[PDB]
């Protein structure tokens, strides 16, 4: 939970929101449709929107590998401040810069 978390937005709405009000760097966290109960990060980068699933194992949260965190907010806050730690599978850096709404 915090100023990027949208408790009631779909993936689609999220990428329309990011493509209309966001800028390159804008992100939010939302509920996951594939895994009800979990959250997803959506980020506007390059000329599109990237969606990253967040694993809640039942013990911790992570990005299906990488650093683990006790709450969802510690996850996001970490990747927002630690430069270069969020990367796609292919190695390109994902930037978590502007918390939307």
């Amino acid at each position: 939970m915090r100023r990027w978390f949208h408790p009631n937005i779909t993936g689609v709405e999220a990428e329309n929101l990011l493509l209309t009000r966001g800028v390159d760097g804008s992100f939010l966290a939302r509920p996951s449709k594939s895994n009800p109960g979990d959250f997803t990060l959506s980020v506007r980068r390059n000329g599109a929107v990237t969606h990253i699933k967040i694993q809640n194992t039942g013990d911790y949260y992570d990005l299906y590998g990488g650093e683990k965190f006790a709450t969802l907010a510690e996850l996001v806050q970490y990747y927002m401040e630690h430069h270069g730690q969020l990367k796609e599978k292919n190695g390109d850096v994902i930037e978590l810069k502007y918390p939307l709404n």
């Binding site: 993936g11 299906y64 990488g66 990367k87 796609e88």
Partner: peptide, 9 residues
Amino acid sequence: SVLYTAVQP
């Protein structure tokens, strides 16, 4: 639905 991006640790 939407498309997902895996992350590299």
